[model samples]
Target chain A: ELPRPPHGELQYLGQIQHILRCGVRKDDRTGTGTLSVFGMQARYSLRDEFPLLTTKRVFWKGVLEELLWFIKGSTNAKELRDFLDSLGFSTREEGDLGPVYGFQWRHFGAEYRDMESDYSGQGVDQLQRVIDTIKTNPDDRRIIMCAWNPRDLPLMALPPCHALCQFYVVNSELSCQLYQRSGDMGLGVPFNIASYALLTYMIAHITGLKPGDFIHTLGDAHIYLNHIEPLKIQLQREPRPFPKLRILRKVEKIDDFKAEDFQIEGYNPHPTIKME
Target chain B: ELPRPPHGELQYLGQIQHILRCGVRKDDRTGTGTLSVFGMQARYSLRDEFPLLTTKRVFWKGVLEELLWFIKGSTNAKELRDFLDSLGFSTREEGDLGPVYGFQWRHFGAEYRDMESDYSGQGVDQLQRVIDTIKTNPDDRRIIMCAWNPRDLPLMALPPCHALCQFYVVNSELSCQLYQRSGDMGLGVPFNIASYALLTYMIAHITGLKPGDFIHTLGDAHIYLNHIEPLKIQLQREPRPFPKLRILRKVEKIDDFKAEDFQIEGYNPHPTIKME
Candidate 1:
């Protein structure tokens, strides 16, 4: 028997529960083990409250910061690391995460020589192009940004899991679809869901449209076998009404906003889940 | 009211019925108009049978030849055009459809200078890489091949509609998912379904694994405004059992097989639905 999911947040909990119930046992690259399935999708509407999970507290600050970093087209993890260090999460490890999300989103297709390479002036700006298309030709079917670049795959520490994303506009409202090749349902998926939803909100803000929906499609959606306990705990909790995401100030350019400009209200949750 | 979609074919038809009943009318690039929805996914278990539709006849030969052309990494439209011309489908128009399907599969990320540019030796062979990964690192999460290239999108006649594809192997069976940004429900979707299914079969055969599932995920899955009548005609007829795809010869390599080596039996269907 299954428990009824209280509200919109159950979409996330439902997948976790479903995977736990019926997913196949499989060995994974991380050696952590997984209960995996081939294809799954979940949809969140902006018309409903912002899709922050009330089942557990999500780190909204990190989500907003990552989106801003990708928008600024900054690949060096030093900036992100430095920000973390300032917040007392310091580590002695070098901060360069090597051609990660920001690098792929802004500088796709151009030769990425190295982390120290001067990619400051080269490559296509897919996010900027998405902005342009949403403004000028909203009806165009090719408003897509692909983060999976095969040419640069060898040079990166890890290839992108959130590989392809496309935006659609209708009736003066914007909706986004993200095609993630692989998802870590326990730890990474909650982050993935919140991060892209933030992106959709920010883009819709600048594009002069209401946020429509965020559709997340995953290829290999699985829960780490080690994460089964905490996920089940999460599944037991009744979901609260989703919190709302608010952008405090209006900014013209995509990169003009700061971390202070974003906020989330009514985000009360049970507790944070631990990852192994 | 919607009728029950009997058997597996109903999944595909159910979406069409859902879209026609509830889809938002939107103006599109081609000006043909559409009843469009943002995100939808369908799953087909290859264990039951091959996923070819029996409601209407799909040209399976053309699908095989197209797949072979991509596997051979022949980007030029000349060879495909010549084959079609030989089959009494000759036309006076230039046979080159620009850098379409085959070109993207094999030579993705290679700079497509022009139709006349020499690209024989350039770019990555994703097919070979996929085969190797299936054999060696089957548990790796990044086994993806992308046909949507931002650099080459501007150069091609039309950017790839079926843009991103990823493969997964679990329990020694291969499953594939295709992220197509846009699908023409009436005219192009049936062919897209069968084309990728055949590709999955071929790869599984070469990799010494049984075929598992083909999951088709779409961004803007829509029925064209003009194609409504033909689609309805397709809807009225009950879908027959899916046809079985056969590879007539044992070929060690992906590209060594010819068109005559393929066969499909029990593929009787209603007359082909004509589209404008």
Candidate 2:
């Protein structure tokens, strides 16, 4: 059994508290001012349980399907939009997400004309390369996937928030670290935590290793002014144990895993807080 | 006055201890086995004092000179070699360091021919863009400079370890976060800390903001088997107060600063620990 009071959730809550108390009020790109802290880091253990935040219920289906879309190397937002719509989540945006996370992950240097263009076997297949590096050379220091392409920035609808991630393998356990340039502490951060944690789990399962840790390092970690009240309500609640992620079957290839192949067990959480 | 027992140095020492205790034994690219931990972070306050690691003396001159070389956007190792030789530090390697840190910083996406070829106005000048963004739009989340160029990785002498960095501005203060893929905890990490901290100070000076924090986040943080004893000795010493960096004159542009223009003050560290 895991330890009492999930450390990962506590870390997330603590970050919220830190931003609320000491963060600087500053204007942002969206014109919504934020209480922001510059640099922050939190480690979520993926050993026995997945760190799907238990303070407030996380959108697990959204996390899983979005990751699967990224793994598919699908740049079209319509694919994800359609999937989320089927799951009863409203996504108004359509067409391409522009050479976003998936395009950069699967085909890094490939010329991205549009969402409809075929990029079969084009550019460096970084995801496959990451898996191969882990299986072949577990100790390789450069096992990295970068989504922040300076050349592709002009073409992107939204620049990647989780820019670069590096994978490390030791003692038959895989650990991943993400360098996210900016995070919305209230809404985006919790979702991102689950997304990367699930990514680590999937990679670990495929690589025949145990998931070790997911270290989330942020550049501009902030809470929006409107989120202040909702986060304050969230801080008053206690954390429950993180649920275990059970992969239904043995998955040999990274591309083969579907959303239905995984299950979340024993997740009991407090009520969700609404934020705009 | 700064607090006693410098928190940054203590954090560094604590990491060495953690790696020594719980780190997994793993083989590395250099064929040297190491006691390695996957992820770690330490924040050095650049507000009043520079974190030049007072546990053991760090080579400040080398840090400053090499940074100046990088700022000059010269990929030639000979330029750095000749300068270091003048300062009585021998550098045996010559020719191009390839399209390494400086080239990636100043000219990303530029076609690389050779070190002798002129890259006058080619490629994206990320450094200048970062400075300009800070001055014009400080709240931009994508204020980043990356050195890990996948296209140029094969053409380089060595792939960058200090792979990517992001700059943040808030409340008239500038902070920087570096995501290093791997670190030689004994020697390389100390030098890197001083180097990035100095970079932050230099950028803050030119951009008219006070230096905030130098957050160093590591992927494969390791202590070589040979470095273990030296690091153990390093851990035993009491930390001295961190030194303050003083820029001699007010430099407006990033590229105009020279080696003689900077000074390190009150850096009375313990004797250096030698490791093979």
Candidate 3:
């Protein structure tokens, strides 16, 4: 028999501890020093439970709204400005986030005139293509969605952290593997974990397959110096069971997913520990 | 204190065994069925040792020659066609491999006219940029090289299997992480492991840093049906000590290194197992 799927929360917590223990001291672009490990991988099983970390409560609203905005292929941060403001997050210059994840996902290679310019059916729709390939050629090895556009990086507000991802299908179950070049193990990683897991779950639901695993691979996994103490407290807390994600109704298309259609069940996380 | 690095060859064997024991049978594009698993990671430490697999003799000459060809940014197979032929590997069509790894590495945004077209200083030289970043800004997270150009995929000979790679620097040591979308575990994977490890060694030599590790992450890791029995026999053989890669001369530039400069010391292995 195959081994039992590992606890995603514990794996995540262990990664944080590993970085704290063995990671080297390094300075980053933000002028913040960090304890960093070069390469790390974690497997979060999505068989029945979603890997929303029960160690700390992730910003679920932001994850859902931002994903929906990305699905719409919006480069303009104005689309998400109001929702983010409601979540106590602010995009100060609420115009274009430039040709970021959404644009690259749905319309790669399309000429970018401006954020407001219509790019409908202009470039190669990778997300749609990913869905189609999963339905038609489940065994194909090239079902990939990439946001790290070297040509478009200069135009983007930020280079993609979770850059490239590939999809795999085996035994009628869909799995995804993401290669993130850098991750903030304290704050950003928890949200990233939940976001990608939801993305896998959504794609699996749309393609009529059960969700398998979301494997996250990182190049520079680091804990910022300022957030180190908060994470230490987080590491000391025992993890509760991961919550189950329920979709209210059938969603035929990837673009059709809505925040209202989803619900998180049995998420009993520890009290919030704020980290800058 | 950090744990000693795991034996890369033994890890590779364990992966093969794991796939044979638990991999799901799946059809592939080549019409060859495979026993496959998704999302596997292996780390080969390049610290005073090179991970040239000793279970079966690997094509060391081919690894050296092809990497040299790639560093030269030559898209024309004609350059290596003769060398490859000498190695008993035939590329029937002796013209362009078409805007492949070399092209994407050196000239990402440059217009591709043909294999013969001069691309000298045409686009972003990512390989040189990687070296520059490693020297000037060691903590940079964007020290990456990507071969999966979505816009150029349709014009290629074959889609890149070892698609994206990122370089990391910590404690004055350089490491590399490769995200290969698909890996042919029996044949292509061994060659790939050696190639990337060699690439890391070369870059480390150029930048005056110690070679650290090559972390290989794969999406679809599979063994072809025809090669199963041979691999089973190969896996039974114990792995010998990994060989050390010696750079005979200090190569200041990435492109200055030649095939003659590299010497593989003490690579003892069992008899070669040929598979189709």
Candidate 4:
């Protein structure tokens, strides 16, 4: 049997570098389309280990908060921003970040209850079903949870960040995944992958199953239509090892998992690359 | 020019076989789990010439009605029972048929007029966004529309069918995909693939792009965990030629596409494998 591995710091760093290197290259009919390089794809075998960036003093508190904020289906970024800064660091640029997914889903136009109800209600979230499917009918190919609702686009503060997600329970392992509609290769994708991996870990831990692959599928997964030069510089550097993340809080209700619930074990990173 | 190859009946049948034969096989250690299988992935590049399927007729009418019903987010089986019955087909006994996706997404217990008019009321249909994304930002790996929300489960008439979807635009080609969380290998999967391919075809045709590829990513993708014996028996029979699906009408709205708009020109199967 394949045993679980500890989270590595440098490996995740390499993933970022890979995205920076490859960028998003699709059919480049328009000469400039090739230039739009953004987004990274990170897959973590939760069974092998919990993934976190161990090299760079990875920020677990902020990550957990953001995750909790999402679970709450909240559209407010201020709460998250304040909490992140309270932890002695700040990553979110402004109010635009947090209110993106949850707000649009739950509140839409500020009716916070609607947002909450939407997520907690049926015709929406698939996590519980995914878990149930894995347990009751492991062979059902249709065990998937999707977050992207075409009808809710206008209500969103930003386009849905986690667009499409599917989970697979194979070979005695259970996995859950989230697909982001947009990944700013240099800035966001890494955080997204690690957090979701942690989310997967939490669910698996609760349900008594091994973590499987977090298959991330992206659509307009581009770096930026104009960030090739800077992307190239980052890719030129070797990727550090991926770090392992640890969530300190043992909460049950998804909403209860807070920002402080998680702790980064060890993180290593190459010198941070500058990108705007 | 690769002339649109005549009906690829064998190809479609082979895919049906491939889904079952080449899927992830895992032991449900939980014992609570249903089948020993976990995942199977299939991808077909829908070129300008090769429409996704050349064999087997897609239940286009059912797909349209279901898509519309899911938008309502209605979970009552009776809500769509009449619609499905009119077509002389049913996914009864089996949990929510694939079309279950449509009912919950738009209806979801709450209606949009039930929706707050505050968010500019753009009433943006995400399906349209996917079409636009295909036309505009093909490389940005973020053009996906999802309908399943985990919180919206218990109220569901049945479990979701096509739980998630993602699209890719390579050059002038556009492709839309469906990820069914619980597909009936014998009765549903083939028609599911064909209908989505047709959806992709119509969407691409409208969006000024040729068709690209339908990448189907499965989660608990499986044949019913209990129909192992029946599936094995059906596998021995040769699937006949694919019938030509003659779409009677061209539609612009994702919701408005109807059964009358289509006709299966030639579909000959080796007799339905009674799936009990």
Candidate 5:
């Protein structure tokens, strides 16, 4: 039998230790150095607890808002910046986040426009199609949502790091596998793990299925050479039980849920650790 | 330290045991059943022997021809069928294996017009770009080649199973990672592992680097219910030493190598097992 750790939070921490031990020191596109390892996977079963880390505080508000933004089929960072601004975070860019997750989720192949123009006639509605497929043919293996658009790479501010995610349903339970091409392990990966878990929950909720597991697969899973100290500090703290995510209401549609509609229960962590 | 098997073939054999023991029985798209597990990874370091399986014979010719087909940038199945037919494996259907690997690797966004029409101005040359990047910016994390194009999905007969692969270089050695969306553990997977390992060696050869490791990350790793007995029988055999792959000549261009230019030495395995 495959080994299982008691607490699901160990998935994240195990990867951190694995990378610290075996990772290669490599230079990245961001000009920041990284302790990187290629092809790493972390799995979290929803039957136990939400996959959010217990070693440090995860900004749930940011994760929730960003997920909702993508479900709304938005690409413009301007809308997200507005939400972030109202929440007292400032932004510099005016337009969308360069056809990021939301745009790719809904309108994959369509022509992208700025915040001003209409995007109604532009791309394929992949998100809706997947929801429909899960409801209709959950057994189909092609139930995939790919965010890495090569044509749109030049148009995007930052090309997609988490490029593809495919969903599978077995016995009325949904599991997702995310193929992320590059991961900023310190700041980006934990957020990604929790963000996709939330997305999996949101989709499973709307589609009337139970959440199974979130399988996170990474290409370049790396700790930023700069964030090395913070990660090491975060690693020293003991991991607690993962918080349970409770959806407050029966969500009829993917876009119908608000940021405050979710609840986190029993999340007691050591402290918050911030990295640049 | 990560555990190392005496022979690399054990990596493939071990997964068979893992999945057979732990996989959940699930109905699949083909109406055939599977004992499937999600999110598995296998690593093969080229520093050791080449990772050809010794449990059962893998068709080295098929693997080499297909890799040449992709590197030659021929997308239409007509070309592959021609090659296969010459190898005495006759097949039906005129064209459009539905935008398979060769098409996406070369012309990712190019609008496919059946088997005819000039696909000149369409899509990006992802493979060529990757080769160039390896030559110039070996450390770049964006040295990725994605074969899963959502826009081109409808045009493809079978969507790509091995969706994306990213290459990395450190310490003058090149390593590759493939994110395969679905792996047919019995048949498709053994071929895939060796094929990409061969590809890594080829690219490293031409790009002036040494082959390092091939990390294979899978989404749905499952053995067909039909192939279970054969795989189990095959697993009873001992794993022999893996063969070594030698390129006979110095090849500068990706497409210039002939089928006879490469050699596989010391591949003595058990008799081949066939499945539908």
Candidate 6:
């Protein structure tokens, strides 16, 4: 079960550290030198309580920005870069591809070029796909967003970032849990939390249902070795109860929104634990 | 949409290569370096035909071994090393990890030292999870597995070994498809198809349900740069129709399955596409 959040940054950061502290490696898989930690899970819901980490520090602005990007399925890093830059946060560099998830799901390998898909008339947003499945077939028995494109692996500075292939849809009262094949608990898990929660919120918003939970079933999840020390320092600091997440209800198409459409209330965590 | 089996190794491999020529990377506030891809729906109904690949070659042995490993959730490179070595197939390194999926998913690191989760509760096998959900909660939103453990990210010589997370269930009679993400396609997808189909077969066999289509929704899928050329060579070949997979009943627990339990009826392709 995804550790229930009453969860603060402390808990999450700790999970990241735990995974990073001990993961397997193949050697020479990445130039970064085989620091691979995969397989983990965590989940949260919006129905009973909004999923805002009460623990350490949750980046309210960043969280919302990322979510909006996914729904919009934007692959341009500059757009997210500019969005984050507006908040005075340094955008991602080589290892920092802001529009990563959105890019993969929406417009893979064509951020700046042209590509051909084996199929035609098939471009479905992950969020909408999940929502429609819930509404249409509910038990189609298969709901997934695969990110395992063999041809595109090398183009990535970071190898097939979070190589996810399939996900299952558990029918609950609007609460949705994602079975993530890979997650970086420390840095990535939290965002996945907010991002998917936002997804659940949006899908439910339009689908005429109350949101449920975002359960994360993970595969290769880990925290970077460089991020370990900071997490340890933050572990001693406790996170508060979850804050209320307020989505700017004005956005129509969940895919057409930006990171600026979210608002969180009552989130309290320790000072930001800086990442190298 | 995933095409029928009996596919040519070359064609299927080529498609992955083509689609991946355009992949995406996602590095949120988390550590950067993740490639992603999306959208695939395939079909292989046993009633329609056998799942022999007309495309390229099939590593019938490797596919069976990997599936058994997943069911066991047993992560010990030694056992896998023995298996792979016996087949004259060596992985990353001799001491390096063998089939590592089971090892990580089962014994990841010292962190989760003795805590291994088979996920047999809720009347589900790793394969049954999809079947039960689609049959019962067809519209349920979150149906998946978290095979990507971030904690083990650093230890992996590569990154997440479990390339993808998948969800499967049934529609009125057909089986719909979906996947969350995948890590390496060149080396992983062929087996991915067999494994899932085998899983589908096993579930269908047990449930007495008719076979349906395989919808593969992907993210972060790719062929490592090192494997590019080999995959290209493989693309020259066509796949044969899919072979039939027969699972020995009696072994109720997916983990309880043995290599002998599977029976492949037909498989014809070119030489094995070898890669380090």
Measured against the true two-chain complex, the DockQ scores of the candidates, in the order shown, are: 0.50, 0.51, 0.52, 0.23, 0.45, 0.03
Q: What does candidate 3's lDDT look like per residue over B1-276, in tens digits? A: 000045678889999999999999998875679999899998888888999999999999998898888788876867972222322123335565556567767886687877788899888787888899899988888887766533335533323334678899988899999888888899888898888889899999889899998998889899899999999999899988999889999778988998899999999988999988
Q: Write the per-residue lDDT of candidate 4 for residues A104-173, one digit (tens) a residue.
A: 3333333233222343452334455556666787544455444543333444433443454566655657
Instruction: Using lDDT as the measure, name the better of candidate 2 and candidate 5.
Output: 2
Model 6, span A1-276: residue lDDT tens? 011125533445556556556654422223232234333344454664566654456676776665565545544445552233422124334233433355455544343321222312234344455556667754332344444323234432222233332332223345544654445555666666776676667666666667654555554355556766776676666556666766676655556555555666776656665565
**Which residue ranges in model 4 land beyond 4 Å of their true spot?**
A1-42, A53-62, A68-78, A81-110, A113-173, A206-210, A225-243, A246-267, B1-41, B51-162, B166-171, B185-187, B225-276
Taking chain A of model 6 alone, its TM-score versus the true chain A equals 0.68
- Candidate rank order under DockQ: 3, 2, 1, 5, 4, 6
Model 6 CA deviation exceeding 4 Å by range:
A1-17, A20-38, A81-103, A107-127, A147-172, A179-182, A248-252, A256-261, B1-276
Which runs of model 5 end up more than 4 angstroms from their true locations?
A1-5, A75-78, A81-101, A116-118, A148-152, A155-162, B1-6, B75-101, B111-123, B148-152, B155-162
Query: If both were scored by TM-score, which would come out higher, candidate 5 or candidate 6?
Result: 5
Deviation in angstroms for A123 in model 4? 14
lDDT tens digits, residue span A1-276, model 1: 000034767788889988998889887655767999889998888864688777778888887887787777664667762223322123225554455467766776567555567876577777788899798888877887766533335533323344567899988889998887777888877787788788888889998899998898888899888889888888899887788888899888887989998889888887987878
**lDDT agreement with native, every candidate:** 0.75, 0.80, 0.80, 0.50, 0.75, 0.49
Candidate 5 docking classification? acceptable
For each candidate, what TM-score against the reference?
0.86, 0.89, 0.89, 0.59, 0.87, 0.43
Error of 2 at B196 (Å): 0.8
List, residue by residue over B140-255, the lDDT tens digit for candidate 2.
88787766533335533323334677898888899998888888898888888898889999999999999999998888899889998888888899998898899999999999
Worst 10 residues of 2 chain A by lDDT: A81-90
> Could you tell me the interface RMSD of model 3?
4.1
In Å, residue A86's CA in model 2 sits off its true spot by 27
Q: Provide the lDDT at A176 for model 1.
A: 90
What local lDDT does model 2 show for residue A272? 72
